[PDB]
């Protein structure tokens, strides 16, 4: 990741303040509501017929937390996202058949949720570093597609 030291530092400082439980459920729920075609991968989660249904779904919440836990690992491995997510990439490709374009959608939704949560603290420079991180993670998750 061509991340600047000041970029790494800003990403890390904000992340130490993130409530993963709240943020994960919100990001995953928002992806499914804003881009409803992504619901195709989550049929087994139950009712996803309305925003409230989605946002309230406990499987959506629990899976959100897990996804964001994985995202946390990446932040501790920013100089090697590829090796960090190699297995998860293989799994999303060979077992789950998820179009990597979805990784990019989730990334931008995540940025929107961090803004919603941190308000003015999510300054344009902080956002810029996070955009690089979400693109980095998406690319690492797509790396073992074949």
């Amino acid at each position: 990741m061509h991340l600047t030291p000041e970029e790494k530092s800003a990403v890390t400082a904000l992340w130490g303040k993130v409530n993963v439980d709240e943020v994960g459920g919100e990001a995953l729920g928002r992806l499914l509501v804003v881009f409803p075609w992504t619901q195709r991968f989550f049929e087994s989660f139950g009712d996803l017929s309305t925003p409230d249904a989605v946002m309230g779904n406990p499987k959506v919440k629990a899976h959100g937390k897990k996804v964001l836990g994985a995202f946390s690992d990446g932040l501790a491995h920013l100089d090697n996202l590829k090796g960090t997510f190699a297995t998860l990439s293989e799994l999303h490709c060979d077992k789950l058949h998820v179009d990597p374009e979805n990784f990019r959608l989730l990334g931008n939704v995540l940025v929107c949720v961090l803004a919603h949560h941190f308000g003015k603290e999510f300054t344009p420079p902080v956002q810029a570093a996070y955009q690089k991180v979400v693109a980095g993670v998406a690319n690492a998750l797509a790396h073992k597609y074949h």
């Binding site: 490709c93 058949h97 998820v98 179009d99 990597p100 374009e101 797509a142 597609y145 074949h146």
Partner: peptide, 9 residues
Amino acid sequence: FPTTKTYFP
């Protein structure tokens, strides 16, 4: 564009 194959498993 191999990613398109995810739609035809």
